[PDB]
Amino acid sequence: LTEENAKTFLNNFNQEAEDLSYQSSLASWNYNTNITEENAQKMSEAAAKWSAFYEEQSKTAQSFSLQEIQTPIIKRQLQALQQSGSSALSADKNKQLNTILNTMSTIYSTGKVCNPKNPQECLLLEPGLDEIMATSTDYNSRLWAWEGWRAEVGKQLRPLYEEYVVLKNEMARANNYNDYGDYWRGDYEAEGADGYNYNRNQLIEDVERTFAEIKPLYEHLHAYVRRKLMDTYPSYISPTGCLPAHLLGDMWGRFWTNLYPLTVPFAQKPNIDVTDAMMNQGWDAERIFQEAEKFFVSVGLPHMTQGFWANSMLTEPADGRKVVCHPTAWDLGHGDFRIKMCTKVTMDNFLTAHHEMGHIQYDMAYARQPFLLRNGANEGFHEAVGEIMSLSAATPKHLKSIGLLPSDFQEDSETEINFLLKQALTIVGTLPFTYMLEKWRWMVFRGEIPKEQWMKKWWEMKREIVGVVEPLPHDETYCDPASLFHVSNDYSFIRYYTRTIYQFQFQEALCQAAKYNGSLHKCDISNSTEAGQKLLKMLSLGNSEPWTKALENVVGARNMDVKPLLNYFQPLFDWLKEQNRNSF
Amino acid sequence: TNLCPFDEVFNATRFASVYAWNRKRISNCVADYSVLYNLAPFFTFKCYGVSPTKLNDLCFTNVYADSFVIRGDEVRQIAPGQTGNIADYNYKLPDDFTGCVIAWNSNKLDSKVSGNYNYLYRLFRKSNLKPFERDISTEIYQAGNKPCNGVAGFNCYFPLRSYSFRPTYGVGHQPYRVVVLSFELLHAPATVC
Ligand SMILES: *[C@@H]1O[C@H](CO)[C@@H](O[C@@H]2O[C@H](CO)[C@@H](O)[C@H](O)[C@H]2NC(C)=O)[C@H](O)[C@H]1NC(C)=O
Numbered sequence: 001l002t003e004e005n006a007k008t009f010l011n012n013f014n015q016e017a018e019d020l021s022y023q024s025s026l027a028s029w030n031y032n033t034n035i036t037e038e039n040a041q042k043m044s045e046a047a048a049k050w051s052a053f054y055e056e057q058s059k060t061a062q063s064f065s066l067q068e069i070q071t072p073i074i075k076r077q078l079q080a081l082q083q084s085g086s087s088a089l090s091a092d093k094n095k096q097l098n099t100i101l102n103t104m105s106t107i108y109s110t111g112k113v114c115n116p117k118n119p120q121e122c123l124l125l126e127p128g129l130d131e132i133m134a135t136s137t138d139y140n141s142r143l144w145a146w147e148g149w150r151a152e153v154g155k156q157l158r159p160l161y162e163e164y165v166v167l168k169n170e171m172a173r174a175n176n177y178n179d180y181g182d183y184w185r186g187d188y189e190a191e192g193a194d195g196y197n198y199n200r201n202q203l204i205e206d207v208e209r210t211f212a213e214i215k216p217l218y219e220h221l222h223a224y225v226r227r228k229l230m231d232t233y234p235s236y237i238s239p240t241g242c243l244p245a246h247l248l249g250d251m252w253g254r255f256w257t258n259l260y261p262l263t264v265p266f267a268q269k270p271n272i273d274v275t276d277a278m279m280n281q282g283w284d285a286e287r288i289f290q291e292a293e294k295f296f297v298s299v300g301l302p303h304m305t306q307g308f309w310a311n312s313m314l315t316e317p318a319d320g321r322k323v324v325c326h327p328t329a330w331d332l333g334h335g336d337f338r339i340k341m342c343t344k345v346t347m348d349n350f351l352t353a354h355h356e357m358g359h360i361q362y363d364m365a366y367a368r369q370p371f372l373l374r375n376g377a378n379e380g381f382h383e384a385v386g387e388i389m390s391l392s393a394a395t396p397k398h399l400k401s402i403g404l405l406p407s408d409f410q411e412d413s414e415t416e417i418n419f420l421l422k423q424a425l426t427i428v429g430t431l432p433f434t435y436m437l438e439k440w441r442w443m444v445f446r447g448e449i450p451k452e453q454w455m456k457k458w459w460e461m462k463r464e465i466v467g468v469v470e471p472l473p474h475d476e477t478y479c480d481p482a483s484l485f486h487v488s489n490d491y492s493f494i495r496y497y498t499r500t501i502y503q504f505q506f507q508e509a510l511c512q513a514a515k516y517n518g519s520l521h522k523c524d525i526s527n528s529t530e531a532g533q534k535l536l537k538m539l540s541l542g543n544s545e546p547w548t549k550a551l552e553n554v555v556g557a558r559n560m561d562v563k564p565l566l567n568y569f570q571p572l573f574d575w576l577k578e579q580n581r582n583s584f
Numbered sequence: 585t586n587l588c589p590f591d592e593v594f595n596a597t598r599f600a601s602v603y604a605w606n607r608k609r610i611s612n613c614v615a616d617y618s619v620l621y622n623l624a625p626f627f628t629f630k631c632y633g634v635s636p637t638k639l640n641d642l643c644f645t646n647v648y649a650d651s652f653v654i655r656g657d658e659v660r661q662i663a664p665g666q667t668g669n670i671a672d673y674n675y676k677l678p679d680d681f682t683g684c685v686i687a688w689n690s691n692k693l694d695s696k697v698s699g700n701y702n703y704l705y706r707l708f709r710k711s712n713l714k715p716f717e718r719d720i721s722t723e724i725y726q727a728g729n730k731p732c733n734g735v736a737g738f739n740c741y742f743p744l745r746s747y748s749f750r751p752t753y754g755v756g757h758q759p760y761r762v763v764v765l766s767f768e769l770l771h772a773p774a775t776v777c
C-alpha cells in the first residue's frame with residue numbers, strides 16, 4: 001500500500017534479515033574454522049532458514065507493485081529484494097530445480113588426476129602442492145598432463161548444459177527479461193534524471209570504443225613475449241605455425257614463477273629481498289596486519305574494532321581445526337568484521353593482507369546503509385578498492401620509510417621498470433582473456449543452434465583473433481569453460497574485467513588529489529588526508545546512489561576510462577618503444 | 585545519613601527492556617554522584633541540561649531514575665529532543681529536559697553466548713510516543729487495510745522485536761546499559777541533595 005506500507009515492510013525485512021544473516025555468517029565462519037560436518041550440518045540448516053525467509057520476503061516483494069510510486073532509494077531496495085533469481089513458477093516446474101543444484105557442485109571432484117594407473121607420483125587434488133608441481137616449463141610434460149585434464153572433465157558436461165541453459169532461459173519468461181546473458185549485464189540499470197537515462201544496451205555500444213580502437217597497442221606486447229621465448233630455447237615458435245597455448249606454463253594468469261628471472265636480458269641488477277629483512281627483524285602475522293592498519297589510518301580511514309583482533313584467527317590452528325586456506329574478508333552481520341587468512345609470513349602474504357584490510361575498510365563504510373544496500377556500488381568496485389591499496393603499498397618509496405628496506409638504497413632506473421613489468425604483465429594481459437571469455441559466454445548463452453556447423457567458424461575466429469591453437473584437434477570429449485573455480489559454480493567474469501579499469505581510475509584520481517611532484521609512480525595514498533576523505537566519500541555510499549553518479553561526483557567520468565591506465569605508463573614508455581623498432 | 589539507592593539501581597543484575605523500562609521513584613535520599621564514575625574509564629557521561637558538575641550542594645525534588653539496555657548508536661538517539669527509531673517509539677525526552685544520561689558498555693554482563701532474547705524493543709508504533717510513556721502492549725501492528733485478527737504476516741507485524749545481544753557485535757550493536765536522571769522541580773520540600 002503506497003510508500004506507507006512499503007517503508008514498514010522494508011524496516012521489518014531489514015530487522016529480521018540482519019539477525020538471520022548474522023546467524024548464517026556465524027555458522028559459516030564456525031564451519032570454515034572448525035570443520036567437523038556438524039558445523040556443516042548447522043551451517044546448512046541456518047542457510048536453509050535464511051533462504052526460506054529471503055524467498056518469502058521476495059515473494060512479498062513481487063506481490064508489491066513498483067510502477068511509479070517509489071521515487072527514493074526505497075525503489076532501489078525493493079528492486080534488490082525483487083531480484084529473486086531462479087525461483088517462483090509452478091510447483092510441477094520448480095520441483096526438478098532442487099535436483100540440479102545438489103548435483104551441480106558434485107561434478108568437480110569426479111575427476112582424479114595423477115600418473116595413469118601408476119602408484120608412483122600419484123597424489124589427490126590439493127591446492128597446496130599443485131602450485132609448485134604444475135608450473136613447469138617443459139616441452140613434454142605439458143602434453144598429457146593438460147590434454148587429459150581438459151578431456152576427462154567435460155566428458156558429458158555439454159550434453160547436459162545444452163538443456164540446462166534452455167531450462168534456465170525458460171525461467172526468463174516471468175521476470176520481464178529477454179536473455180540469460182542480458183540477465184547478468186542488466187544489473188547496471190540506473191537512472192538519475194532526465195537526459196541521463198540508462199539504456200539496457202549500454203554495454204553493447206560503449207565497448208567498441210573502449211577496446212577495439214586501442215587493440216593494436218595491447219598486441220605489440222604480445223609480440224614482445226614471442227622474441228623472449230625463442231632465446232631461451234629454439235623451436236618454441238614455428239615459422240609457419242603458431243605457438244602452443246598448452247605449454248605457456250600457466251592458464252590461471254596469476255604469476256610466472258619461472259619466466260620472471262629470464263625476462264631482463266642483462267640480469268645484473270639485484271632483485272627485492274623483502275623476506276630476508278622480515279624474518280630477522282621479527283615480522284609475523286600478528287604484526288603485518290597491524291602495519292596494514294597503520295597504513296590505512298595514516299590516510300584517514302578509521303582504526304579496526306577491538307574485536308577484530310579478538311576473533312580473527314590470523315595463525316595456524318591448534319587441535320585438528322582444518323581450515324579452507326583462502327584469504328577472505330568477512331563481514332559477520334552487525335559489524336563484527338572478522339578476517340580469515342591462515343598463512344605464514346612471505347612476500348605475497350603482506351600484500352594480500354593489505355588487500356584484505358582494504359576489503360574490510362570498504363566494508364566499514366556502508367554499515368549505515370540499509371541491509372539491502374550494504375554492498376559495493378558495483379561488482380567490480382569491492383575488489384578494486386582493496387587492490388588499489390594492495391598495489392599502492394608495494395612501492396619501494398613506501399617500503400623505505402617504515403624500515404623494511406635500508407635507507408641507503410637510492411632508487412634505480414631499471415629496477416622500477418622491472419618492478420612495473422611484472423605488475424603490467426600479470427593483470428594487463430588478463431583483460432583480453434576475460435573479454436574473449438565473456439563475449440564467448442554471451443554468444444553461447446543464446447543457444448540458437450547446436451554445434452554441427454559453428455565448430456569450424458568458432459575456431460577460425462579464435463585463430464584470426466589471437467593466433468593460438470592446439471597442435472591437434474579433439475573429438476566430442478572436452479569443454480573449455482569448466483576447469484576453473486569461478487566458472488564451476490556459474491559465476492560472472494566482468495567482475496575480474498572492470499576491476500582493473502576501476503582501480504586504475506581511482507588510483508589516478510587519488511594521485512591527482514595527492515598534489516605531489518616528482519614521478520607518477522612514487523605517489524602514495526599514505527599521508528594524504530584529503531585523498532582519504534575523497535576515497536571515503538565514495539566508499540561510504542553503498543548501493544544507495546548509482547555507481548555512475550558515484551564515479552561522477554568524485555572526479556567526473558561518464559563510463560570506464562582507460563586513459564588513466566595508459567597514462568600510468570605513457571611518461572615511461574620509450575624503454576619499450578625503442579625495443580619494438582625491429583618489426584614492420 | 586541515608587545513602588540514596590543509586591547503588592541498587594546501578595549495580596542491578598538485570599535491567600528492563602526498552603519497551604517497558606522500570607521508572608524508579610527515589611526521594612529523601614542524598615545523591616552522591618561522585619561514586620558513580622568509579623568503574624573503568626569508559627563511561628559516556630555526556631550530561632545535558634545542567635552543568636557537568638552536578639552541584640552537589642544544589643537540592644532537587646524526587647529524581648526519576650529509569651534504566652534500560654540499548655545498542656551503541658541508540659545511546660546517541662537518547663537525547664533531549666532528537667528523533668530516530670528509539671527516541672520516537674520507545675523513550676522520548678522533552679525538549680526542556682533537566683538531567684542527563686549515563687550509558688555503559690555492558691558486554692560481559694548481558695551478552696549471553698549464542699544470543700539472549702530477553703531484551704525487546706518496540707518497532708512499528710505508528711504514533712510518536714509522548715515523553716515519559718511506557719506503552720507495554722502486545723498487539724500485532726496493522727498497517728494495511730486488512731484487519732489483523734491475532735495472526736501476523738503480510739501487513740500484520742508483531743511490534744516487539746528483539747535485540748538478540750551476544751558478544752562479537754563490537755563497538756556498535758552491543759548492550760549499552762543506559763540509566764537517565766530526570767531532575768524535576770515540582771514545588772514541595774526539597775529532599776534529594
Ligand atoms: C568445534 O566444534 C565441536 C562441535 O561442533 C566442539 O565440540 C567438540 O566436539 C564434540 C562435540 O560433539 C565433543 O567431543 C566436544 O564438545 C568437543 N571436542 C573437543 C576435542 O574439544 C569443539 O569445541 C569446537 N572447537 C572449537 C575450537 O571451537
Ligand SMILES: *[C@@H]1O[C@H](CO)[C@@H](O)[C@H](O)[C@H]1NC(C)=O
Nearest residue numbers: 590591592594595619620623
Ligand atoms: C557496584 O559494584 C562494584 C563492584 O565491586 C563496586 O565497586 C561499586 O561500589 C558498586 N556500586 C556502585 C557502582 O554504585
